[PDB]
Amino acid sequence: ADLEHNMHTLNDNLKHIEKADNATTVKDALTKMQAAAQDAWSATPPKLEDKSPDSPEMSDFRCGFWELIGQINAALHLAKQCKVKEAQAAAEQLKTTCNACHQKYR
Amino acid sequence: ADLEHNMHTLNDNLKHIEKADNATTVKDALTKMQAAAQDAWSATPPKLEDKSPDSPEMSDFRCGFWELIGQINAALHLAKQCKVKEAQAAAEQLKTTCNACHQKYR
Amino acid sequence: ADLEHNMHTLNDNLKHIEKADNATTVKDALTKMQAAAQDAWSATPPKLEDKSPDSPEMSDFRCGFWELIGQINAALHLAKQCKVKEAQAAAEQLKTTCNACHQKYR
Amino acid sequence: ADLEHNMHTLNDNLKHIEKADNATTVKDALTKMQAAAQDAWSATPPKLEDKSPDSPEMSDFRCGFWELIGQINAALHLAKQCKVKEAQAAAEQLKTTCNACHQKYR
Amino acid sequence: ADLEHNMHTLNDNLKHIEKADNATTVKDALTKMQAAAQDAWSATPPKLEDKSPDSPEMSDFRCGFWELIGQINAALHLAKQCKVKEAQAAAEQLKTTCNACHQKYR
Amino acid sequence: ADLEHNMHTLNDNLKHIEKADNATTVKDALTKMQAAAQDAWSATPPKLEDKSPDSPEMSDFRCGFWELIGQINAALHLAKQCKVKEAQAAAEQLKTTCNACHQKYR
Amino acid sequence: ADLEHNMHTLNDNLKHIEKADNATTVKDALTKMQAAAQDAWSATPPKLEDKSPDSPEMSDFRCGFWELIGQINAALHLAKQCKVKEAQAAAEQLKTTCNACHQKYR
Amino acid sequence: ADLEHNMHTLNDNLKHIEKADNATTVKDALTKMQAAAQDAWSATPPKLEDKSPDSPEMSDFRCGFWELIGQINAALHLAKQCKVKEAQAAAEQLKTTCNACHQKYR
Amino acid sequence: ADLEHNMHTLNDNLKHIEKADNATTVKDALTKMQAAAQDAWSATPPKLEDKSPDSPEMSDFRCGFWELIGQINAALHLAKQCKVKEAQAAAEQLKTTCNACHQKYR
Amino acid sequence: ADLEHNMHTLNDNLKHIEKADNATTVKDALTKMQAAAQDAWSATPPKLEDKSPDSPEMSDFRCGFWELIGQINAALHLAKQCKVKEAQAAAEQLKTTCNACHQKYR
Amino acid sequence: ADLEHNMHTLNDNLKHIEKADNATTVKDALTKMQAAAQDAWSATPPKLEDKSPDSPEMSDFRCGFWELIGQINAALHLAKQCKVKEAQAAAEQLKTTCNACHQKYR
Amino acid sequence: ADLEHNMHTLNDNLKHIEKADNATTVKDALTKMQAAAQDAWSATPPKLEDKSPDSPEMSDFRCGFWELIGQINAALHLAKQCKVKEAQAAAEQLKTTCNACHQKYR
Numbered sequence A, B, C, D, E, F, G, H, I, J, K, L: 001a002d003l004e005h006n007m008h009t010l011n012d013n014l015k016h017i018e019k020a021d022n023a024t025t026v027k028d029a030l031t032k033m034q035a036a037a038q039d040a041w042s043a044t045p046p047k048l049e050d051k052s053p054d055s056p057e058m059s060d061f062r063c064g065f066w067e068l069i070g071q072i073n074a075a076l077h078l079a080k081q082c083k084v085k086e087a088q089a090a091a092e093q094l095k096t097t098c099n100a101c102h103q104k105y106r
């Protein structure tokens, strides 16, 4: 899918995690965020469209999705041990990673 | 396979992309280039054979294949939307990545 | 599994490689080390528990497991060609990578 | 998933169909709408929560999702024949079915 | 496939059931009739092409295929118990269902 | 299987749901009731054996199993969210559906 | 499942074998008895609950299910050769095995 | 298959093991002997046809196949480590097990 | 694997069961103990290396692993019902079985 | 199926290829013709029923289906490259192969 | 396997077909003869060992196995329709094909 | 793929067989040559483009690929028995088959 629809999936499933009361809801929402972040890792943002794909802008862009994938995988590891409150607090810390990318490329 | 045969697969399938007229030929050639670049990422070139596997030469070598994998994945994303001319121009830009590695390790 | 049990798998299977006499034992022990290193890449060590997940400590920690995964994949490539002595000497070189991480985070 | 999230999937994927330019985007969005409508067929709306599950309100509710499933299946049949404009006009006619259910149960 | 080819499959396989002498022929012909009736359930006949898909004509059309699917499933249940004469007489009763639909929409 | 054995499966698994204390027992008993109700939907009861398969008795018989399948699917949806008491109370409401069918066809 | 429900499956499917008239009914009932006897082999009866799991009571209990599994497998071997009367008489001989266990542990 | 054909498979594949020169021939012949010994474990020999299936003859018969299965599994364990001479000498020791059963039941 | 490595798997996973706090850790550790006990059932201990494989020492050795497999299967049955304390106390009783084998063959 | 029904499949799907307007219809009709020609290759025509299966009539009969299979495979190769007009003209040339067999054996 | 063992499979399974009384025995023996004839089609007989693989002896050898494969496939087609006597008489006609090859190459 | 790319696969993998030192390289190169020769069997060479597909030129063309497939299958049979020198000498004999086809159709 597009980069814009992959951001629809990350935004919608993150709001379902804060309101969840069981561990099946948190575990299923974190699996869709993992698949949407891997599809968006190779894309090109509209503000870097006239650059070459070897640029230091396109190197820092791909390094930001690989930090997000490692944090989604760590929060999914807590949800499989049925630790709902620990997995919900780990997903709240995701917003500092995706505020730092919006200041540069969004 | 060897590093030498993985370079046979990348070179042969790239010449079939420039002469293709349908979107099934471009989509099938980009899938073989993706599998050959992942097998070659862990190999050791003959000009770095007497180094240790923690070297800053063996760190820049593996960083060059991971930039190529992200560009093959982006060109395969355009070919599945049946955009043949956009996927052919993205594969022409691959040659700047693999001219910069040949000056250092080939 | 935990970070502590993933270190049990890497330590036990490495001692079986030095005493092996056939190529089926070396090839099966290197496959379990590959799966245990990928599960441990996203974890948090106890000495970095009060840091944020965007830290330059948590960036150098994940860069150390990705260097180990590339060396296990290269030694598994020699074991499938039935080169037992070359795959055993490549697994002995793994100890320099995992002595440098124990000085900083263990 | 909930009834509320199944309505998030139907609303988001319908807006991607009107702006699509290829037949792979239309065919993939209609497949997610088919799976979200089948999961929502058995649910209970909040305005019928104090009824019994044998009611003539809960009979007309389930008859409305089965009319929608037959229209999504017919529009997916046109998209597999690469008829993009015919499948886009069939998805615009879906809004009369889901305006008649919102007047009674939403 | 089209509505016209799905009627080719129902007509041809019904004539093979009356002339069959073993239970493997009857069981294989009833499986193709089941798959052709489910593909035709969502289609639009040419005499209802200018109606809306919420019509009481398009509601009685889909109710007629769902009565046929339940009769094919019951005759396939007798053929798996190796009751050839009971499954052949149940397939002869199918013609009253598909004479009543031809008077209205064919 | 027969209609009589499909009623053995619905009756036995319903009594195990009222006495269950964990969510794995409720989730496994509701899956067998779903498969037994779909096999019985196409059958013919002994009190309608001399009717034709287009009758308004055989239309109300198949409409009664389709209401039961939607209630088993809704109770299985609560059991996967580990809501044991809500799924047990939804299975108690199933008895009004299957008292109304026994007054007419049993 | 429990030990009590595994005895529900053995008792119900044995009564369907004596009344069967085709070889598909006998072959399907003997397959469910095979799966229910293997799940019950490791269980603990309520009259041996305060023993240790190394007892000579718990050794004779597990030896009785392993004699029953070999007799169900032999009767299923006759049913696949379409020998219905030989497989029905072999299932009648099962009752001497399960009268000898009820005198000691039931 | 029959008891007589399962003895055809054990006799033919044992003579191919003594004449083999590679480890693929020994490993493939020992896999067919494992499947033929498990199918024959539940059978009834012609010299015990008029006994009951709870007899001490039918208990010593099944104990003899379970000793053979453990010896075939141990010889297959040596063949996967590419130890051809050790796996060939372990298959020669199988003949003492199957001379002791022929004196009693053949 | 060897007999010595199968004892590494049983010893390590048993110590993780006593310190576990959730039911996913207990259920995953009991599955690895089940696979390691079945691979070790056919092996030969070093203190019985000069015996024949029909010995009454090699008959009591294989009878000891089959008692352990039935106790691991019973403790895994409690862990799937999310009964953590009952499955932890059943795994503590395993040590009497494996103290009696070490006095004779270790 | 019979030889007569395999000729029903070849005749019906060939008339759908000349009237097709997309490449999904041509590609799906050529796949059913490939499976029907392979099932008919081993059959015996009614005009050669009293011959032996080593005859020079039964050798020229099987050589005629093997020429047809190679022409269906070549036309299916053009349809996967989305060349509809080239695949439709290749299927028109099939009629010379199946006019030459009807003059001798039909 | 070898050419000699593939002739062991064809000879043993042909003698089980003449003595069979059900259709499951004939259908299972004809499936093993089909797999053994395809493995032997590419082999080289010992009396043609010093020829080149382009010889007119090695062309008539491969043409003889391809006539046998078509006769085994035709006899397996009768066995799936539960025609035991027709499939047994078709397997008796196989001996004329394999007497003509033994006069030239055996 | 094209006929020209299928000749790229046969030419490249044949040169890797003469320089190989293990049996995994020879076995993997012979598997790609088998798949490329089956895709090229149905193609049309450019020097026979204006012929009809029933010609005696197009009959001798398809007979030449079927002789090559039988020689690749025989050399792959030696490589699975770990006979590297016998499989390398069998692949050298392939060049006489593909010199005789180049004199007529290339």
Ligand code: HEC
Residues within 6 Å of the ligand: A003, A004, A007, A008, A010, A011, A014, A045, A046, A061, A064, A065, A068, A094, A095, A097, A098, A099, A101, A102, A105, A106
């Ligand atoms: C860069 C490394 C990013 C990370 C990590 C995340 N996002 Fe993102 N976001 C990024 C870009 C370049 C864009 C614009 C691309 C475009 O064409 O839209 C966005 C956009 C969004 C949006 C707006 C969607 C829209 O309809 O325009 C949303 C709602 C959004 N992003 C959400 C979001 C969140 C919550 C993230 C953290 C978990 C996140 N994104 C990651 C770049 C990057």
Ligand code: HEC
Residues within 6 Å of the ligand: B003, B004, B007, B008, B010, B011, B014, B045, B046, B061, B064, B065, B068, B094, B095, B097, B098, B099, B101, B102, B105, B106
């Ligand atoms: C480094 C990061 C590389 C990238 C990206 C690509 N190649 Fe490569 N190439 C590299 C090395 C170290 C070598 C020598 C290894 C050896 O032992 O051969 C090569 C070699 C080639 C060759 C020559 C093959 C031969 O037979 O010797 C070719 C034809 C080749 N490379 C092609 C190629 C192309 C077109 C690439 C860009 C898409 C490419 N390679 C990537 C290092 C690296």
Ligand code: HEC
Residues within 6 Å of the ligand: C003, C004, C007, C008, C010, C011, C014, C045, C046, C061, C064, C065, C068, C094, C095, C097, C098, C099, C101, C102, C105, C106
């Ligand atoms: C960092 C990048 C590491 C690499 C690479 C390896 N190890 Fe490790 N090790 C690391 C940490 C942070 C820890 C402590 C975590 C904890 O909570 O235990 C460890 C620990 C070990 C242990 C001790 C296990 C225990 O019971 O405490 C062992 C035996 C061990 N590590 C082995 C080991 C080896 C041999 C490695 C090289 C192949 C290796 N580990 C990799 C960090 C890192």
Ligand code: HEC
Residues within 6 Å of the ligand: D003, D004, D007, D008, D010, D011, D014, D045, D046, D061, D064, D065, D068, D094, D095, D097, D098, D099, D101, D102, D105, D106
């Ligand atoms: C009944 C038979 C419906 C059909 C068909 C569709 N919808 Fe629906 N919708 C329905 C209900 C009962 C509700 C309220 C349930 C709740 O608890 O939210 C809704 C709600 C929506 C919403 C609001 C989502 C929210 O966050 O509250 C949207 C955006 C929505 N529905 C969209 C939608 C569209 C576009 C449909 C046609 C294709 C459609 N729904 C189908 C009942 C029914």
Ligand code: HEC
Residues within 6 Å of the ligand: E003, E004, E007, E008, E010, E011, E014, E045, E046, E061, E064, E065, E068, E094, E095, E097, E098, E099, E101, E102, E105, E106
């Ligand atoms: C409606 C609920 C139907 C049922 C049940 C069956 N058929 Fe049908 N049939 C129907 C329509 C609307 C049409 C015309 C559609 C078109 O465009 O052709 C048909 C047509 C046929 C045909 C003619 C095929 C042709 O080439 O034109 C045949 C041979 C046919 N139908 C057979 C058939 C039989 C035997 C059925 C009972 C088992 C049956 N169909 C079901 C509507 C409906």
Ligand code: HEC
Residues within 6 Å of the ligand: F003, F004, F007, F008, F010, F011, F014, F045, F046, F061, F064, F065, F068, F094, F095, F097, F098, F099, F101, F102, F105, F106
């Ligand atoms: C009709 C729409 C039914 C629904 C829903 C349920 N049952 Fe049923 N039941 C039905 C019939 C027509 C029959 C008689 C068929 C026969 O030949 O037996 C039955 C019978 C039973 C029985 C008796 C079984 C026996 O051995 O005779 C039982 C125990 C039974 N039914 C249980 C049952 C329950 C509890 C249901 C609700 C969940 C239920 N059935 C559904 C018709 C219908």
Ligand code: HEC
Residues within 6 Å of the ligand: G003, G004, G007, G008, G010, G011, G014, G045, G046, G061, G064, G065, G068, G094, G095, G097, G098, G099, G101, G102, G105, G106
């Ligand atoms: C021991 C080795 C047994 C064999 C073989 C069979 N059964 Fe069993 N049975 C056994 C026990 C220990 C129990 C009591 C366990 C409990 O908690 O219920 C039973 C019970 C039954 C029952 C009663 C079920 C109930 O609701 O209480 C039945 C109907 C039953 N058993 C049937 C049965 C038959 C017919 C068997 C032979 C084929 C059989 N069981 C095997 C112990 C053993």
Ligand code: HEC
Residues within 6 Å of the ligand: H003, H004, H007, H008, H010, H011, H014, H045, H046, H061, H064, H065, H068, H094, H095, H097, H098, H099, H101, H102, H105, H106
């Ligand atoms: C009992 C516990 C046995 C073991 C272990 C083996 N065999 Fe057997 N064998 C057994 C019986 C009861 C019979 C007679 C059954 C019958 O109806 O044929 C046999 C027979 C044979 C035969 C003769 C086959 C024939 O055509 O009659 C052979 C060639 C044979 N057995 C071989 C064989 C070998 C070599 C075994 C050791 C590995 C072996 N069998 C195991 C009983 C038992």
Ligand code: HEC
Residues within 6 Å of the ligand: I003, I004, I007, I008, I010, I011, I014, I045, I046, I061, I064, I065, I068, I094, I095, I097, I098, I099, I101, I102, I105, I106
């Ligand atoms: C016999 C029937 C045994 C059972 C049940 C268990 N073990 Fe074992 N153990 C057994 C033998 C014959 C041996 C020696 C084999 C060898 O060559 O090592 C062992 C050894 C061990 C060891 C030592 C491992 C080592 O490195 O030498 C351990 C740690 C061990 N066994 C643990 C263990 C436990 C805890 C068991 C109960 C659950 C158990 N084993 C089962 C024989 C048998």
Ligand code: HEC
Residues within 6 Å of the ligand: J003, J004, J007, J008, J010, J011, J014, J045, J046, J061, J064, J065, J068, J094, J095, J097, J098, J099, J101, J102, J105, J106
């Ligand atoms: C021989 C090598 C054949 C080829 C190639 C094709 N057909 Fe055939 N055809 C053949 C025979 C021996 C028979 C008679 C068998 C019988 O018992 O019917 C037929 C028959 C037909 C029929 C008539 C079907 C009927 O109901 O009788 C049709 C419509 C038919 N064939 C069509 C057909 C076409 C169009 C083919 C070319 C693509 C074709 N067949 C191939 C022998 C052979």
Ligand code: HEC
Residues within 6 Å of the ligand: K003, K004, K007, K008, K010, K011, K014, K045, K046, K061, K064, K065, K068, K094, K095, K097, K098, K099, K101, K102, K105, K106
């Ligand atoms: C050639 C085209 C053959 C066909 C068809 C069949 N066989 Fe064969 N057979 C053939 C050869 C070249 C050989 C000798 C190869 C060798 O090294 O053994 C054989 C041998 C046999 C044997 C003897 C086996 C042995 O142990 O030596 C048997 C029992 C045998 N063949 C049986 C057989 C039957 C019954 C066939 C018809 C169905 C048949 N083979 C096919 C060549 C050919």
Ligand code: HEC
Residues within 6 Å of the ligand: L003, L004, L007, L008, L010, L011, L014, L045, L046, L061, L064, L065, L068, L094, L095, L097, L098, L099, L101, L102, L105, L106
């Ligand atoms: C006919 C029966 C052939 C066999 C067997 C092999 N080849 Fe071929 N070859 C054939 C043709 C008709 C053509 C020309 C087709 C075209 O359009 O190119 C070829 C061509 C080649 C080439 C040239 C590739 C190119 O880029 O033009 C090569 C390198 C080649 N063939 C290699 C080759 C080898 C080594 C073969 C033996 C194993 C072989 N081919 C088989 C016809 C036939």
Ligand SMILES: [Fe+3]
Residues within 6 Å of the ligand: none
């Ligand atoms: Fe980096």
Ligand SMILES: [Fe+3]
Residues within 6 Å of the ligand: C082, H082, L082
């Ligand atoms: Fe080897």
Ligand SMILES: [Fe+3]
Residues within 6 Å of the ligand: none
């Ligand atoms: Fe209705």
Ligand SMILES: [Fe+3]
Residues within 6 Å of the ligand: none
């Ligand atoms: Fe015993």
